[PDB]
Design a protein around this ligand. Structure first.
Ligand SMILES: [Mg+2]
Length: 98
RNA sequence: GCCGUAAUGGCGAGAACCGGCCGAAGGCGGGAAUAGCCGGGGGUUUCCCCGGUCCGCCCGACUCCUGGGGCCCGUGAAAAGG
């Protein structure tokens, strides 16, 4: 699976929440299906997402790139530490879960 | 894309924008006009009385405060006290 191509499909067809602060809110208040975290996320951010996603029962996929590379894989000109997939519109981004 | 600077620029690692919190030198009132000063008088040995002590602008530090940026094979004390 190409992570980037499927992420751009989930963004444009479904509902994708982009950014650490909004991802945390979705985990705490919403019901996201998958959370993706960049490999070079800071220790404080990784532990926060790991803890909240655990209590929320949401799987975490660690993107194999930096937050700069995750942003490029989402066709964004900015970093993305973490993003939450709430709706996989026409992609199979949920294939990353297993 | 959007927001900038004297200059460097800033943002999903959270921008613009809106509301708030902490927060200088110093300003202003009180001190305080009763003082001091200026002018006009009367005493005596330094005392008493009278009038004014205003309006509107500008420059402005080497003094005081604040923040930004840069440099170092150089990194710019310690303790009492609080
Ligand atoms: Mg200049």
């Amino acid at each position: 699976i190409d992570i980037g191509r499927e992420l751009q499909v989930a963004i444009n067809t479904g509902k994708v929440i982009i950014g650490l602060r909004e991802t945390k809110k979705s985990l705490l208040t919403g019901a996201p299906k998958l959370v993706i975290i960049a490999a070079n996320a800071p220790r404080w951010a990784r532990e926060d997402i790991e803890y909240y996603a655990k209590l929320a029962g949401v799987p975490i996929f660690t993107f194999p790139g930096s937050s700069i590379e995750l942003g490029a894989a989402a066709k964004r000109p900015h970093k993305i530490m973490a993003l939450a997939v709430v709706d996989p519109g026409q992609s199979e981004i949920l294939k990353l879960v297993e």
